[PDB]
Amino acid sequence: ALVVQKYGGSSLESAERIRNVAERIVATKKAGNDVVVVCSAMGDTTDELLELAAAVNPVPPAREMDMLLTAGERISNALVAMAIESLGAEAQSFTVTPGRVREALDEGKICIVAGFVNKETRDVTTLGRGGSDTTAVALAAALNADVCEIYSDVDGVYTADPRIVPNAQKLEKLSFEEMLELAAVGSKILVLRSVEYARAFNVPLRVRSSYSNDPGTLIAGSMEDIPVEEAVLTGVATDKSEAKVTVLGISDKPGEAAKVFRALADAEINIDMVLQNVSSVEDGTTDITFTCPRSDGRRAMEILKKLQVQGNWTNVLYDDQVGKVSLVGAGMKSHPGVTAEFMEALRDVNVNIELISTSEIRISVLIREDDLDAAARALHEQFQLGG
Amino acid sequence: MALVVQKYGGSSLESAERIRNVAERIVATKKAGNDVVVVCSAMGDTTDELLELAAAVNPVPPAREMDMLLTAGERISNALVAMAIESLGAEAQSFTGSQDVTPGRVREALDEGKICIVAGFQGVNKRDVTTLGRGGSDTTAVALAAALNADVCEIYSDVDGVYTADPRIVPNAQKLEKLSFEEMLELAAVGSKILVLRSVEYARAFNVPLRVRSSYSNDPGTLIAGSMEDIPVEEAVLTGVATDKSEAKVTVLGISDKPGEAAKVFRALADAEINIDMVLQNVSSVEDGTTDITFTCPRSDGRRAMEILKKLQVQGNWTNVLYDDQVGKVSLVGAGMKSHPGVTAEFMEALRDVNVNIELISTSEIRISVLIREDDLDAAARALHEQFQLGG
Amino acid sequence: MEEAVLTGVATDKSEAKVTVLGISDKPGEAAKVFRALADAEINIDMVLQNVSSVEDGTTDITFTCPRSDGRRAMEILKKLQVQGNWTNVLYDDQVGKVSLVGAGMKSHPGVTAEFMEALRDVNVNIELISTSEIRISVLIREDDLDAAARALHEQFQLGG
Amino acid sequence: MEEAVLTGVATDKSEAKVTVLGISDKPGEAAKVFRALADAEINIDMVLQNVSSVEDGTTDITFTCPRSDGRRAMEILKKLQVQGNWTNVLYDDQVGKVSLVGAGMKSHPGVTAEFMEALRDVNVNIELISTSEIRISVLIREDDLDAAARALHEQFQLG
Numbered sequence A: 001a002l003v004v005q006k007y008g009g010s011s012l013e014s015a016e017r018i019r020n021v022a023e024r025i026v027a028t029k030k031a032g033n034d035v036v037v038v039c040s041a042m043g044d045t046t047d048e049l050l051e052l053a054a055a056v057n058p059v060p061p062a063r064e065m066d067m068l069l070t071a072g073e074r075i076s077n078a079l080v081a082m083a084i085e086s087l088g089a090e091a092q093s094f095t096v097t098p099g100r101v102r103e104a105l106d107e108g109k110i111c112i113v114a115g116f117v118n119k120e121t122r123d124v125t126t127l128g129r130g131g132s133d134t135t136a137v138a139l140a141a142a143l144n145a146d147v148c149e150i151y152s153d154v155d156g157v158y159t160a161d162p163r164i165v166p167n168a169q170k171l172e173k174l175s176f177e178e179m180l181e182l183a184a185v186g187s188k189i190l191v192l193r194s195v196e197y198a199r200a201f202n203v204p205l206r207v208r209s210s211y212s213n214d215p216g217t218l219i220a221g222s223m224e225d226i227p228v229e230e231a232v233l234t235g236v237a238t239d240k241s242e243a244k245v246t247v248l249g250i251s252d253k254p255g256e257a258a259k260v261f262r263a264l265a266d267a268e269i270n271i272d273m274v275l276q277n278v279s280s281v282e283d284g285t286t287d288i289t290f291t292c293p294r295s296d297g298r299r300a301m302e303i304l305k306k307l308q309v310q311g312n313w314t315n316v317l318y319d320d321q322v323g324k325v326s327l328v329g330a331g332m333k334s335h336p337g338v339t340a341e342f343m344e345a346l347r348d349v350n351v352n353i354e355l356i357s358t359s360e361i362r363i364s365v366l367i368r369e370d371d372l373d374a375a376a377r378a379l380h381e382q383f384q385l386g387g
Numbered sequence B: 001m002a003l004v005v006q007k008y009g010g011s012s013l014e015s016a017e018r019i020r021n022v023a024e025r026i027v028a029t030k031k032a033g034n035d036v037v038v039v040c041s042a043m044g045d046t047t048d049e050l051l052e053l054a055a056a057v058n059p060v061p062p063a064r065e066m067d068m069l070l071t072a073g074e075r076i077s078n079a080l081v082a083m084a085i086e087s088l089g090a091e092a093q094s095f096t097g098s099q100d101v102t103p104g105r106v107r108e109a110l111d112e113g114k115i116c117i118v119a120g121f122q123g124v125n126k127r128d129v130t131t132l133g134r135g136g137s138d139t140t141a142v143a144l145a146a147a148l149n150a151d152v153c154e155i156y157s158d159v160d161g162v163y164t165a166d167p168r169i170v171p172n173a174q175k176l177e178k179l180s181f182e183e184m185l186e187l188a189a190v191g192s193k194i195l196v197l198r199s200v201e202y203a204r205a206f207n208v209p210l211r212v213r214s215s216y217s218n219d220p221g222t223l224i225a226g227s228m229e230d231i232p233v234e235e236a237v238l239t240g241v242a243t244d245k246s247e248a249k250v251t252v253l254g255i256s257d258k259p260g261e262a263a264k265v266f267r268a269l270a271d272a273e274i275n276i277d278m279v280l281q282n283v284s285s286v287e288d289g290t291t292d293i294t295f296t297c298p299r300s301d302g303r304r305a306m307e308i309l310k311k312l313q314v315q316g317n318w319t320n321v322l323y324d325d326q327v328g329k330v331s332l333v334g335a336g337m338k339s340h341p342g343v344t345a346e347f348m349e350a351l352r353d354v355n356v357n358i359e360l361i362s363t364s365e366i367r368i369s370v371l372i373r374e375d376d377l378d379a380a381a382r383a384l385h386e387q388f389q390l391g392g
Numbered sequence C: 001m002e003e004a005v006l007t008g009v010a011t012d013k014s015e016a017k018v019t020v021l022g023i024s025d026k027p028g029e030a031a032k033v034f035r036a037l038a039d040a041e042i043n044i045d046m047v048l049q050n051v052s053s054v055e056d057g058t059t060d061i062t063f064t065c066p067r068s069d070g071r072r073a074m075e076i077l078k079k080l081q082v083q084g085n086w087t088n089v090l091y092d093d094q095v096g097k098v099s100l101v102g103a104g105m106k107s108h109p110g111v112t113a114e115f116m117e118a119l120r121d122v123n124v125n126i127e128l129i130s131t132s133e134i135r136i137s138v139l140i141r142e143d144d145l146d147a148a149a150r151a152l153h154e155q156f157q158l159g160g
Numbered sequence D: 001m002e003e004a005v006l007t008g009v010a011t012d013k014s015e016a017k018v019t020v021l022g023i024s025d026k027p028g029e030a031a032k033v034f035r036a037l038a039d040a041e042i043n044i045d046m047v048l049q050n051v052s053s054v055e056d057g058t059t060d061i062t063f064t065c066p067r068s069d070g071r072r073a074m075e076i077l078k079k080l081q082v083q084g085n086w087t088n089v090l091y092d093d094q095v096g097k098v099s100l101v102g103a104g105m106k107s108h109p110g111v112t113a114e115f116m117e118a119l120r121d122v123n124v125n126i127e128l129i130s131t132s133e134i135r136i137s138v139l140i141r142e143d144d145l146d147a148a149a150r151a152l153h154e155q156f157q158l159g
């Protein structure tokens, strides 16, 4: 019986909550489980540290940044260790091989691991700094835990945002892929990279609250291995944090998309949902649309406008009042009519669909941000996700 | 060559702006033709906040986790100062733990032109001494300075020197240019909290010169260097006056002057973790064969100190336990008072002439300390300072 | 902090794409297309619709479906063509799909740039793009598929 | 942090202690004692004065000086005995001094406690005490020096 428990900043905001969590950790041990614990920095510390970083050095070097964020994490880990020790558990902190943790687990110790470059396979390519989520699932993978519990003030994954959709329901369960897609086009309960790690190693994840004893939502099993007759629609996600930029009149020949996205990458614009449809046979030209965070919208336009005046395309458009709504579900892979019903739902609340993008288990559209509530509500009840 | 180790306190590193300023100061020191080792305290008041979190999550925090917690706090500063220094063109190398950092690894890095940032170094002691508690940033800075035979160890903060008295209380108080190790320890033992005592003791043990200076100005500050023993008698002087009103005075009346009785008092106090100081006991009476034992402790600890000793009054055979929390401490320090008669006389006369009553007296070879009413402290400090013509 | 994985490269040549040209950009128009396809019980996968032009108020809608259904799909839509709406319906059963699969790719725009640059350098032309945080997909000629995969494998050091 | 270091044990037997008994606790009285010694050019080291008693408002002042100046000091003070209404001036040229030398000992009351406990366990009586953050000094019979020093070395693991 091996449980990995990760606790986010919200779960560790104060001494009182650190002690509460510690008893929660000890209870899990008492219930007959070996326990490995991973802690984020105490609520908001990370954001404060990133802001110090940027102020002391624009473009902070990766080495010192990791050093910085690891220090933040170590604070929580030392405190949680102290709290566990006070409730009679024997604590062991790690700064760090799976074997060494296993040794310590076998002596009955609750292991607190701050962080380790975590790769699933020798070939995969890894980018950025490993965070708490991914060290937690990596540990869960390496030690072959039965579940990797992700604790926060979020108590599950819902079929929509409950404040907007009153019939929203906490999901019992969903597959890695379905969770990957929801998190791709909406708020991130967990880091995407970490869920993908989970998927690769088949580590079940449990999203649950450190404030209640609700058992939360299970993320387990691949979508491939769910039989077609079981496959269902999982949920609806919305987002109003993005701008959309469209480059009009790019000539359809090799290398032109590269000009657009190299210019954006060099300015560090976090682009997404790139979309390009077929060029017109007449003109030999097409358009490319993408979304970026609204804060990046200005610089994206300044960059692409320079290139427009160099003559690479006809125009560049900027739109910062756009929203996106999505439907995700393994159930839509093999069943015709889901797309039709999606479009029908928004038609019936007189919502115009501006742009459409897709994965095999997801439909996403862009609309006016003011139409989001209506759209989400219409889709949710059209597909009967909890009423 | 020219090897300078620099320690920067929390006040020096309280913000991003200050860290960049410090970074430029670190780089300027490099540019002036020195090898540079840097030691950072946690930013601002981090250490106090972390210590508060620690006590709230575990009433008796384990030493191991505490070291981890405090080291994390310091690592934050280290990372930031490393980033700031790299933006200014220097090449930072970061080290940790006592030997990781061997002096050899640091020397190697310094030889490659790197500015070295270090944390957690209590020495490579393979010096028969007993160590207590966790070594702080001051101590690792002087330990590194000892290990690498640095030319100076600079301690930076918002304090720009060691003065002859508190300039707020005595107008004519002035920055000292230099003083000996022993003079510094004596000052710091009775009021001056500008440096950790253990770190200064280390400094004199390995003869590492220290410079107390400010990270907010270019003032060179005060040098702490040389043994007091090596000062020529003719040019040995009185160095400063120090005051303190943070303490309470507890007195145990009527202890039997036989072996083990002092132990009964101080064991009881030690088990309650009451931080006692200035223990004082004079000769017993011979009629009654009893004496009194007085000590000081922080005012916050006084009530507890009294509760403990009162229980032992009833059980044991003491006559009384007194409590006093409006007491003040004034002191005079100086190598010049060794081997020079009339210093004690002038000290007492000074206080007499401003109508200040000397309630308790204690000394070292080069220090006179007296307890008085706290309301008399300013007058005492001025009078002593004036009498001995300190700082012009 | 802003971490991502690039896990692999996937190809496919199982699909056709059908493009409905010049549909009116107003509520209910997409519904007509996909309801028709639904009633014929044609299962589709990719749907691509960019923003309508200011001049005409029309866009195109492209979808992919199993290559055997593509012709029937094109004919079903042609039945409703100009019949109070669109300008043309196209059909293409030689379309290939190549994808970079991973997670967290939004916070590394260099990956998207490098994807495009990889296909440029082996002289492969990109006809459609559809991307997300977890997948960068493009449609090209099925003949270019092998070169594309190879170029992407080399660019991102995945190797297959 | 609360860091401290214990660096060693010192012994000495080069001094005498003189005690002025029953000096009145008012401004100017200590001055008379130390000006007299000063005028005779006697150089002193230790001075200990504990708080005065409520019953008669007097206290004692003990000081140490080189053994060769002791009697002369104790004779300079006798001409002040009646003026100051003192009870007596004691003399003792057989006093030894043992110290534990260190730094930062305030934050470790256990050290002070253990200092006293070590001397108890070797049956040495502590006659006077004067401590600080950097030195724990006691005055004892000179014949107890060796045993005290030895007991301290063991207890604190110096030597």
Ligand SMILES: N[C@@H](CCCC[NH3+])C(=O)O
Pocket (backbone or CB within 6 Å): B008, B009, B010, B011, B040, B041, B042, B135, B136, B137, B138, B139, B196, D001
């Ligand atoms: N020596 C302590 C405190 C240094 C002075 C205050 N910043 C430490 O470990 O950082």
Ligand SMILES: N[C@@H](CCCC[NH3+])C(=O)O
Pocket (backbone or CB within 6 Å): A332, A333, A334, A335, A336, A337, A338, A339, A340, A358, A359, A360, A361, A362, A363, C042, C043, C044, C045, C046, C047
């Ligand atoms: N296969 C479903 C969903 C297609 C959109 C997602 N790939 C349909 O034909 O409606």
Ligand SMILES: N[C@@H](CCCC[NH3+])C(=O)O
Pocket (backbone or CB within 6 Å): B337, B338, B339, B340, B341, B342, B343, B344, B345, B363, B364, B365, B366, B367, B368, D042, D043, D044, D045, D046, D047
């Ligand atoms: N030796 C000086 C000072 C003594 C007090 C400090 N030991 C004097 O006799 O006046």
Ligand SMILES: C[C@@H](O)[C@H](N)C(=O)O
Pocket (backbone or CB within 6 Å): B255, B256, B257, B258, B259, B260, B261, B262, B263, B281, B291, D124, D125, D126, D127
């Ligand atoms: C009075 C006290 O110092 C006692 N003589 C002891 O040695 O314990």
Ligand SMILES: C[C@@H](O)[C@H](N)C(=O)O
Pocket (backbone or CB within 6 Å): A343, A351, A352, A353, A354, C023, C024, C025, C026, C027, C028, C029, C030, C031, C049, C059
């Ligand atoms: C073009 C098509 O998507 C239209 N905007 C609709 O909402 O149906």
Ligand SMILES: C[C@@H](O)[C@H](N)C(=O)O
Pocket (backbone or CB within 6 Å): A250, A251, A252, A253, A254, A255, A256, A257, A258, A276, A286, C116, C124, C125, C126, C127, C128
């Ligand atoms: C339009 C853009 O996708 C172009 N076909 C290219 O390959 O770069």
Ligand SMILES: C[C@@H](O)[C@H](N)C(=O)O
Pocket (backbone or CB within 6 Å): B348, B356, B357, B358, B359, B360, D023, D024, D025, D026, D027, D028, D029, D030, D031, D049, D059
């Ligand atoms: C006893 C003696 O110290 C007296 N209180 C004085 O001030 O002179």
